[PDB]
């Protein structure tokens, strides 16, 4: 049968600190035992001091990302150039997620 | 009375007048024509200046449909365009079962029978444009014109809008004078001419002359704008001609 | 009427809906049977979802 | 007086609108017959160019339906050929769904059917167009068969339609009052193309060039159209007897 | 485009008249004579074929339509709305009853039917009604022989023999004169015959004469042989032939 | 076993008596030979409610076609019809049909497998019995046959059914549809399957069973008075 | 007159009333200009108070980070229209990774305006629009009319008392074309054109509304006292 | 066992004659040259149903297209058979040559495999009897063959197809595509059995 | 898990020298739990009389239908429907769930009240007639009720003679199936009177 | 009659013109804004003294932040304040924060055109 999902493998990690935030991610992309790219960025500038990462399937985790920001860029348009806190970003990912409850984005998200 | 007020109403002539008003539209807009030459069409359009903001050469009215199809229009403009964007849809739907590109004669009912259609029920209006269409096909050169009612023959030559009688009158001398035909840079200096003479009856306002042709020797049956050289060529032939 | 009309099978006036209830009609004969048709058959739904 | 706008009956029982697509039938000013020969079905209708700027090869006003079935239309072209496209379309889906070729009649009923709901439903207006439908038919044999505005239909021993649609019907009349015979007793389909264009010649009073007329043939199992080279030879003959 | 027209084109007026209605009747009153008569062993149905032009093969065009193998039907009025409403009622003969009990309807119900459809274009939205009155006569196990009207409204009445059309009121006046309950069929073809000369104007034989008959059942045309319960059609059209014959005792 | 053989003036079908539910024989007279039209007749094999209802739906609308067009119907229209009825439901409705029958056009054979296939031949045999009687049709069969060789042929092929197919079994039922002439159906034109008499009358004398009650059941609707 | 009852109906001069309608929602509707170098695209907009209390309607809307329009007429119309851009530009990034083109734009306002005056129901969009941007082929300005037709220009104004700053850009065009690498001088040229067009009431710090996009310069909005600079 | 080879005067289609059901021959009559326009043909394999409903679609699509547009190209009636055999992958079991003669392009063949994807081909060979004879074609087909070259080249072809595959068999169809015409070919197994 | 012998029962019809018998056991069940023996098969709309083996709920919802369908016709026909006739419209009403059908297994029976003719017929549950002549059977014991009355049968049985056959066919069927029995109902059917009888029999 | 989306020759919509002239003819409501607070107050005016006025509503919360006085054909209003209600809640659902005061009012606001035929 078709298998609609992939693992291209990748570690991101979050380090919060009292006066700044970090997201790192590995460069590498796989699939199986092959290497795809030695540097495919997995960690975006999304606006508003926001950094997101998507991993997993490498397909989902782009889908995610481009949905988030345009969604940042509905909040500017739709809320008078506001300013997207932390909390309201992270609350608008889960609906993003949840949203695909039933077929999900095979992805670990950390923001 | 009151079989004016609805559109698809048969007056007690037999007459859709609704149609009939939708032409005063056409004959309100500024003058466009079509040439047919030995292998292939040439199409001109008089664009008025109406002021020195106009930013030249940029406000395109001729529109290519698939990439072999020319179209230039008199009227409403947005009515034109909304036009040629069905006939890019039909082109597209033909191609994509077909194969062949579309032959101008089949565009011509695609648009002929959408037009038609907006002459039969009263939820509608007519189309306020006369189009003035063609190509290059395997059959070769056709030109075809065609009115609100939905109403369309191939040409020798088309005139629409303002100063069409004038046109229509420098078109007749060329195919009495050329029974053999007419070269496709001879319909081009032509067109020129035809237009520049035909801006007699907008002559309160100066204007920006826009030719393009399809032939199968000069652009491989492909339909390209005249630009640069040959514009001015074409440009030149026609200042000479009015002096 | 006239005498020309078969009256032992015409009908226009009263009409069966079941076995328990009948009707009169004054109108349209027309409009009376798409009416008439309906209520047989709501009838005939209450039988069959309660069995009264 | 909004009884005279839609198709809804005034209070003489008339639908005006429906009388009026009769009269948009003759806004072209162009006459049409049709005759039935033996193995063939003719029909003639007269072709005006009154542009020089025009395209004559494009000027037309007979169709060709299926293989079989040849439709000459007096009305506006855009109506005609709204009629065209549809006849074409219902003529392909018979074949395609009962698998034999729709015959001459049943298309004529179909487009009648058709022609009758736009006198019956208020949204759609009727089409400005007299459809005349021949054939040679497998199980009728040769066949001609008009709708009209009305969605009314009828089959036909011969037809004519337009301005001057009377003179030619009785010149056809007499000539059937003689003969006897429902048909043109002639073996080839030339002879009865002659027979057609003379007996138009004899009821307009008009003689005509090879680019004047414009000529639909139907024999067994194919109709086609003669070009203006074939009408020439057609006339010569005529002129030469 | 879509059919914007979602509202009744038929409407009450102050009077509580429905204008459309009373139109349409009027359209049937303009309309060429037929009539139907009744007979204790069959029905007739017949009506004058009018034709627009000599040149017009008047045998194309069918006035008398048979409905199912027991039931013919008759119109005065629009033509056109008679065709499309004998494909509607052949149809719904077979989807709301034949599909279902695997017999053709009886009279009184394919009439009852016939009569909806009409009834629909008198309410239903952008929409006029049908401009045509209906005879049907019929043959059926339980209700033996039967002849029914159908008007624009659809509004239906059984009738012993009835005339609807140009002519109606003087040939409704001839009919219940001659017509007993004691008639054969052939009694009722000859009185059928004398009256339609009355309306009829110009040439009367089987040429310009339509004609049918619902009687007895007609093995010859029923196309096979083997099943004894199927015994053939009890409608037949008469032939022009047949037609010349009885008009010479006449 | 169904059977088609077409002859020098028409087509003549064939089919056995038995309808079976497994193992068990549920019908021992069933009637395989319907009537599309009056002179198109088909044998049916495969789904028994499947074949009737395939056949009664498409003779429905092929006779309101008739009237439409005011033609007699052609076997290409019933065969048209039935293909893409059942091509739609891709095999689902398991109706497997021999079509023959005269018209206008001449005399016509064809054969309609449940998946919307159709075929054209002078003998076709469908159903469990088609191997033995496709046999006999291989064996006996030659161009320009006359009616009474075809009947012969025929109904000699669904013996052959009834005999070596346990599926098949009873009578023969025969149509023949000659051109100009009328279709004649043969109900049981062969009867070689006659039940045999009984050793004994198992009538039981009256009152042998045992009746806990008894009553009146009341067919009649609600009286008067 | 008979013939401006819907948008569906042509005059015996093939005129469409229902649309000339529209049309007239623009001219009373306050002033806004437009005008370009080959660097940079200006809009200054007059925005129009109730009264004293009341707050002075925002003219000028953001489509993207390179377009947005000023508007002049019925403001829930220029939402519906600006929202359709936004979109449109939005699917433009999102499906091809292409910023959409100016004239691209123009020919899609165009098209959704023509349909609402072929269709019987609907009406006319009651809105002018002047579109600025900085695409691939550079500074463009762009007018919308409701009746579908979009034009490009080197400058325009529209709105109530236009034809003042159209006369005085129409003038000044071998000018402020010419000012490249200026954004400051081309907003003067701008406040000096839209000042033609006043009337007793002169540009103070919450009446004056300015927006600019250019080759280095996101599409960014002025109100406020970042305009008293400029007054 | 189909095939189509484009020779100087035309274009000629191949079929054997055999349908089955598991290994029981169905019809050993079988016609898989079918019509789609007077000199457009193709060549039916896989499921029975699905290629004659196939056929059937596209002959409709093309008497509509000659109505409107005049003679289709061989070009036009492949992309048709594509749309349909593409469109329907998932529900279709179905394998078309089709074969064609213009007078501008004279003969044209085009191959659609279960896919739905097309190929231009100087010649075509498919069924389950084409994988037999690739080795065999490959070595005897030469461009501008005579008519009567390419009628032995198919007769040879299908001859040894019939011979090693069960599912093919029975007798060799052809149909040849000229300017002169439309000409019917049979050959009965006396005759390619003892080539 | 196979629906047609989930809740169990039969039924039989025969035709005798102008009289039909109908008769049906009266057992409903959870496969091997009996629920209620008072659970009967055969209903009548008018004159025509219909059996119904089965999925039990089926048997329930199709007379519902058959009755409100029957109730319809009479109104509109203005007559009671006939054995012929109502044997068409079960074959019409199944066969509209070809593909989600009923699991049942009804029976026909009744004299056509103008010809005076006996009729029987049985049905598949997608709506297939089987038109016999001599006998009907439906059920978990169909195999047990085809046995007994290939044996027992004889053409042209007078009414009181046809009640003994008919009731020994059912008794002696039902007695050799695990899912059928609990009583039984015998109708005997003449043009103008129906006569209906319950049987003794084995409760286990 | 005529279109319900027509516009007048002067360029304004008849049905929102119209519309401006019922809410002229209702209750007075006024509203202050302070740097301490927003006020809002309405006439109740009771049609007899038997109507119990404590429940004439034409003063309604949307959410903690927001209010809304009403004056004109004031049962309109009860979609307009359930539409009001449901974005400030959906807001605060999809972006966990108050929604702004203006994108409430421009929410509220998008339904004002949304008529026709
Ligand atoms: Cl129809
Ligand atoms: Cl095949
Ligand atoms: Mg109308
Ligand atoms: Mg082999």
Redesign the interface.
């Given at each position: 049968q078709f298998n609609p999902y992939g693992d291209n493998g990748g570690t991101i990690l979050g380090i919060a600190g009292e006066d700044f935030a970090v997201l790192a991610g590995d460069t590498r992309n796989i699939t199986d035992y092959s290497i795809n790219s030695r540097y495919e960025p997995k960690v975006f500038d999304c606006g508003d001091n926001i950094v997101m990462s998507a991993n997993g399937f490498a397909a989902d985790g782009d889908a995610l990302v481009?949905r988030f920001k345009?969604s940042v860029?509905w909040?500017h348009?739709?809320?008078?150039d506001?300013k997207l806190?932390i909390?309201?970003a992270?609350?608008?990912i889960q609906?993003l997620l949840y949203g695909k409850r039933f077929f999900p984005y095979y992805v670990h998200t950390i923001i | 009375t009151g079989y004016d007020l609805s559109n698809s109403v048969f007056s007690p002539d037999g007459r859709n007048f609704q149609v009939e008003y939708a032409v005063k539209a056409v004959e309100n807009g500024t003058t466009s024509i079509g040439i047919k030459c030995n292998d292939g069409v040439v199409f001109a359009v008089e664009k008025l200046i109406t002021s020195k903001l106009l930013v030249p050469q940029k406000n395109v009215k001729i529109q290519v449909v698939d990439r072999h199809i020319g179209c230039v229009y008199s009227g409403l403009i947005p009515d034109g365009r909304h036009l040629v964007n069905r006939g890019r849809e039909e082109a597209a739907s033909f191609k994509k079962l077909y194969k062949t590109p579309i032959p101008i004669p089949a565009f011509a009912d695609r648009l002929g029978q959408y037009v038609q259609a907006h002459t039969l029920y009263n939820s509608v209006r007519p189309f306020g444009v006369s189009t003035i269409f063609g190509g290059v096909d395997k059959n070769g050169a056709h030109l075809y014109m065609l009115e609100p009612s939905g109403s369309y023959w191939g040409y020798k030559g088309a005139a629409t809008g303002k100063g069409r009688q004038s046109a229509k009158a420098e078109l007749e001398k060329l195919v009495d004078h050329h029974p053999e035909g007419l070269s496709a840079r001879e319909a081009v200096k032509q067109a020129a001419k035809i237009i520049y003479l035909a801006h007699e009856d907008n002559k309160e306002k100066d204007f920006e002359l826009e030719i393009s042709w399809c032939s199968l020797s000069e652009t491989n049956g492909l339909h390209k704008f005249v630009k640069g050289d040959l514009l001015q060529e074409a440009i030149d032939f026609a200042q000479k001609e009015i002096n | 009427t006239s005498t020309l009309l078969e009256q032992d099978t015409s009908t226009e006036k009263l009409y069966k809906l079941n076995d328990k209830i009948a009707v009169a009609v004054a109108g349209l004969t027309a409009d009376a049977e798409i009416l008439i048709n309906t209520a047989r058959i709501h009838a005939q739904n209450y039988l069959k979802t309660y069995n009264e | 007086g909004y009884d005279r706008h839609i198709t809804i009956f005034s209070p003489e029982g008339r639908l005006y609108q429906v009388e009026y697509a009769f009269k948009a039938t003759n806004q072209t000013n162009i006459n049409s017959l049709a005759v039935r020969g033996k193995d063939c079905t003719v029909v003639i209708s007269q072709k005006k160019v009154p542009d020089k700027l025009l395209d004559p090869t494009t000027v037309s006003y007979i169709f060709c339906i299926s293989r079989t079935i040849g439709m000459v239309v007096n009305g506006p072209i855009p109506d005609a050929r709204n009629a065209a496209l549809r006849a074409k379309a219902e003529a392909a889906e018979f074949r395609y769904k009962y698998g034999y070729d729709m015959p001459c009649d049943v298309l004529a009923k179909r487009m009648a059917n058709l022609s009758q709901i736009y006198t019956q439903r208020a949204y759609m207006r009727p089409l400005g167009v007299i459809l005349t439908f021949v054939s040679v038919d497998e199980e009728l044999g040769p066949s001609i068969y008009k709708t009209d505005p009305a969605g009314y239909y009828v089959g036909y021993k011969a037809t004519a339609t337009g301005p001057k649609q009377q003179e030619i019907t009785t010149n056809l009349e007499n000539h059937f009052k003689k003969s006897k015979i429902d048909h043109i007793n002639e073996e080839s389909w030339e002879k009865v193309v002659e027979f057609a264009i003379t007996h138009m010649i004899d009821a307009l009073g008009t003689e005509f060039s090879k680019n004047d007329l414009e000529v639909g043939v139907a024999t067994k199992d194919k109709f086609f159209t003669l070009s203006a080279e074939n009408i020439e030879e057609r006339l010569v003959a005529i002129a030469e007897q | 485009m879509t059919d914007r027209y979602s509202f009744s084109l038929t409407t009450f007026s102050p009077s509580g008249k429905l204008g459309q209605i009373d139109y349409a009747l009027t359209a049937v009153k303009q309309g060429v004579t037929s009539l139907g008569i009744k007979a204790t062993n069959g029905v007739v149905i017949a009506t004058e074929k009018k034709s627009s032009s000599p040149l017009a093969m008047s045998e194309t065009l069918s006035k008398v339509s048979l409905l199912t193998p027991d039931i013919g039907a008759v119109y005065s009025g629009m033509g056109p709305d008679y065709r499309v409403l004998v494909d509607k009622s052949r149809k719904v003969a077979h989807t709301s009853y034949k599909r279902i009990y695997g017999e053709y309807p009886p009279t009184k119900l394919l009439v009852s039917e016939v009569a909806k459809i009409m009834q629909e274009a008198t309410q239903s939205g952008g929409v006029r009604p049908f401009g045509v009155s209906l005879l049907i006569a019929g043959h059926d196990e339980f209700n033996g022989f039967s002849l029914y009207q159908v008007d624009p409204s659809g509004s239906y009445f059984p009738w012993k023999a009835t005339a609807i059309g140009k002519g109606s009121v003087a040939a409704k006046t001839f009919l219940e004169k001659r017509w007993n309950d004691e008639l054969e069929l052939e009694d009722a073809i000859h009185i059928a015959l004398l009256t339609l000369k009355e309306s009829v104007e110009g040439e009367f034989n089987g040429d310009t004469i339509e004609l049918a008959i619902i009687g007895d059942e007609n093995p010859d045309l029923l196309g096979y042989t083997g099943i004894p319960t199927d015994k053939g059609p009890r409608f037949r059209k008469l032939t022009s032939q047949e037609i010349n014959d009885r008009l010479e005792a006449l | 076993t169904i059977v088609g053989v077409k002859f020098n003036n028409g087509v003549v079908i064939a089919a056995d008596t038995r309808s079976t539910q497994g193992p068990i024989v549920a019908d021992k007279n069933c009637a395989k030979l319907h009537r599309i039209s009056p002179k198109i007749w088909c044998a049916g094999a495969g789904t028994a409610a499947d074949t009737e209802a395939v056949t009664q739906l498409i003779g429905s609308n092929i006779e309101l076609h008739s009237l439409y067009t005011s033609r007699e119907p052609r076997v290409v229209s019933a065969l048209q019809m039935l293909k893409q009825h059942l091509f739609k439901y891709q095999g689902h409705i398991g109706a497997y049909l021999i079509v023959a029958g005269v018209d206008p056009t001449g005399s016509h054979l064809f054969s309609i497998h449940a998946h919307g296939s159709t075929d054209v031949g002078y003998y076709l045999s469908l159903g469990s019995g088609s191997l033995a009687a496709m046999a006999v049709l291989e064996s006996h069969w030659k161009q320009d046959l006359t009616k009474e060789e075809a009947i012969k042929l025929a109904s000699d092929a669904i013996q052959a059914g009834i005999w070596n197919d346990l599926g098949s079994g009873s009578n023969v039922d025969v149509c023949v549809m000659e051109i100009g002439k009328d279709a004649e159906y043969l109900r049981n034109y062969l009867t070689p399957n006659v039940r045999e008499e009984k050793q004994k009358s198992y009538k039981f004398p009256r009152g042998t069973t045992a009746v806990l009650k008894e009553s009146i059941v009341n067919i009649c609707d609600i009286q008067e008075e | 007159n008979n013939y401006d009852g819907d948008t569906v109906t042509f005059s015996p001069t093939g005129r469409l009333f229902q649309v000339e309608y529209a049309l007239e929602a623009i001219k009373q509707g306050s002033v806004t200009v437009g005008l370009r170098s080959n660097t940079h695209a200006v809009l200054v907009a007059l925005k129009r108070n109730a009264d004293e209390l009341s707050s002075y309607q925002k003219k000028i809307i953001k489509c993207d980070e390179h377009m947005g329009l000023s508007l002049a007429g019925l403001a829930p119309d220029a939402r519906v229209l600006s929202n359709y851009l936004r979109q449109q530009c939005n699917y433009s990034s999102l499906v091809f990774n292409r910023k959409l083109a100016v004239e691209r734009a123009g020919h899609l306002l165009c098209d959704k305006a023509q349909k609402n005056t072929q269709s019987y129901g609907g009406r006319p969009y009651g809105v002018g629009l002047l579109i600025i941007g900085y695409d691939k082929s550079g500074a463009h300005l762009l007018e919308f009319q409701p009746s579908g037709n979009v034009t490009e220009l080197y400058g325009t104004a529209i709105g109530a008392r236009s034809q003042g700053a159209k006369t005085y850009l129409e003038r000044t065009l071998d000018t402020f074309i010419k000012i490249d690498g200026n954004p400051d001088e081309l907003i003067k040229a701008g406040v000096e054109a839209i000042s033609q067009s006043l009337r007793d009431e002169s540009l103070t710090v919450d009446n004056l509304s300015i927006a600019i996009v250019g080759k280095d310069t996101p599409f960014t909005i002025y109100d406020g006292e970042a305009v008293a600079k400029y007054i | 066992s189909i095939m189509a080879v484009t020779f100087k005067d035309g274009v000629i289609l191949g079929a054997d004659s055999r349908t089955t059901t598991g290994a029981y021959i169905a019809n050993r009559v079988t016609d898989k040259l079918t019509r789609v326009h007077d000199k457009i043909w193709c060549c039916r394999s896989g499921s029975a149903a699905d290629t004659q409903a196939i056929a059937d679609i596209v002959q409709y699509h093309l008497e509509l297209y000659t109505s409107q547009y005049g003679t289709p190209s061989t070009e036009t009636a492949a992309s048709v058979f594509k749309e349909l055999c593409y469109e329907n992958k998932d529900n279709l079991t179905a394998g078309i040559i089709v074969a064609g003669y213009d007078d501008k392009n004279k003969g044209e063949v085009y191959t659609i495999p279960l896919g739905g994807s097309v190929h231009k081909l100087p010649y075509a060979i498919a069924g389950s009897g084409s994988t037999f004879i690739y080795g065999y074609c490959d070595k005897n087909f030469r461009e501008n063959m005579s008519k009567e070259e390419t009628v032995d080249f198919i007769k040879h072809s299908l001859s040894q197809a019939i011979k090693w595959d069960g599912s093919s068999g029975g007798v060799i169809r052809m149909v040849v595509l000229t300017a002169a015409g439309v000409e019917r070919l049979i050959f009965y197994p006396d005759e390619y059995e003892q080539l | 898990s196979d629906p047609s012998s989930i809740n169990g029962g039969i039924v039989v019809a025969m035709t005798g020298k102008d009289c039909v018998a109908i008769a049906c056991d009266l057992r409903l069940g959870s496969q091997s739990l009996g629920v209620s023996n008072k659970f009967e098969k055969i209903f009548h709309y008018g004159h025509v009389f219909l059996g119904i083996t089965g999925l039990a709920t089926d048997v329930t919802t199709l007379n519902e239908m058959f009755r409100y369908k029957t109730n319809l016709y009479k109104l509109k026909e203005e007559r009671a429907i006939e054995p012929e006739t109502f044997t068409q419209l079960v074959s019409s009403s199944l066969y509209e769930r070809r593909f989600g059908p009923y699991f049942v297994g009804p029976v026909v029976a009744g004299i056509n009240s103008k010809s005076g003719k006996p009729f029987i017929a049985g049905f598949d549950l997608i709506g297939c007639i089987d038109e016999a002549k001599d006998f009907i059977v439906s059920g978990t014991a169909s195999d047990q009720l085809f046995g007994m009355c290939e044996s027992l049968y004889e053409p042209n049985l007078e009414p009181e003679d046809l009640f003994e056959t008919i009731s020994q066919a059912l008794l002696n069927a039902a007695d050799r199936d695990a899912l059928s029995g609990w009583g039984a109902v015998v109708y005997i059917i003449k043009k103008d009177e129906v006569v209906k009888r319950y049987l003794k029999m084995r409760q286990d | 009659d005529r279109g319900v989306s027509t516009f007048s020759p002067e360029g304004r919509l008849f049905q929102v013109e119209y519309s401006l002239e019922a809410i002229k003819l209702g209750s007075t409501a006024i509203g202050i804004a302070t740097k301490e607070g927003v006020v809002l107050g309405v006439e109740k005016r009771a049609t007899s003294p038997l109507l119990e006025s404590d429940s004439i509503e034409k003063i309604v919360e949307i959410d903690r932040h927001i209010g809304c006085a009403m004056s004109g054909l004031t049962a309109d209003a009860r979609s307009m304040i359930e539409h009001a209600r449901t974005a400030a809640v959906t807001h605060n659902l999809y972006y966990d924060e108050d929604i702004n005061v203006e994108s409430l009012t421009q929410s509220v606001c998008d339904l004002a055109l949304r008529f026709g035929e």
């Open positions: 481009k345009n860029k909040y348009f739709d809320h008078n506001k806190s909390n309201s992270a609350r608008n609906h | - | - | - | - | - | - | - | - | -």
